[model samples]
Target: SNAMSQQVTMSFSVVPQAKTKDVYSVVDKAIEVVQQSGVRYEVGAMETTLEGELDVLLDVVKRAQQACVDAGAEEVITSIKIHYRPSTGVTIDEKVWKYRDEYA
Candidate 1:
């Protein structure tokens, strides 16, 4: 099975810790990295969801943590949840948008 040929969706949160200032500043940098990756992403109040190939998507997560560190966060805590379907696409909108209006 080729992981690159498969689609996976990830929902994750990156929390940054610093000694001098607000952490959201660093957290925003991480989100910015994800935004720049050019993959399918949805930013929520708590976490961000990304959709793409398994390997590339995971690399995006790694870069997100590094973005926080580059922004002067001494420590970073990242939480991730991955849904992978072999030979199929796993998309965030398809899973949630159906119920969007219902929850509103």
Candidate 2:
């Protein structure tokens, strides 16, 4: 199996720690990195999900962690959850499309 070619659904949270200032701003910096990575992603209040090839998304996650570090995070805790299904690669729309119109 080619891991690089396998597509996966991944969700992650990059928690930044900084004693000098607020950490939410550092979180935003990591989010910005994800935003620029050009992956198919959805940003939620608690976490962000991205759809892409397995390794590519992992690299994106790494870059995001680095973004937090560069943004003044003395420490970073990155949590990742990946749904690996190479046989039927899923998209973000696949899981959420049914609920797209509901706001209750």
Q: Each model's TM-score, in the order given?
A: 0.87, 0.87
Alpha-carbon lDDT of model 1 = 0.85
Model 1 ranges with Cα > 4 A deviation? 1-4, 102-104
Q: How far out, in Å, is residue 99 in model 1? A: 0.4
User: How do the residues 1-104 of candidate 2 rate in per-residue lDDT, one tens digit apiece?
Assistant: 34457578899998888877688888988999889988889898888999888888989899999998898889999999988878778777777777988633
How well does candidate 1 score on lDDT at residue 86?
64
Per-residue lDDT tens digits for candidate 1, residues 1-54, read 244576788899988888875888888889899888989898999989898888
- How well does model 2 score by local distance difference test? 0.86
**Clash count list over all predictions:** 0, 0
RMSD of each: 2.8, 2.9
Looking at candidate 1, the ten consecutive residues that score lowest on lDDT are 1-10
lDDT of 1 at 45: 92
True-vs-predicted CA distance for residue 85, candidate 2, Å: 0.3
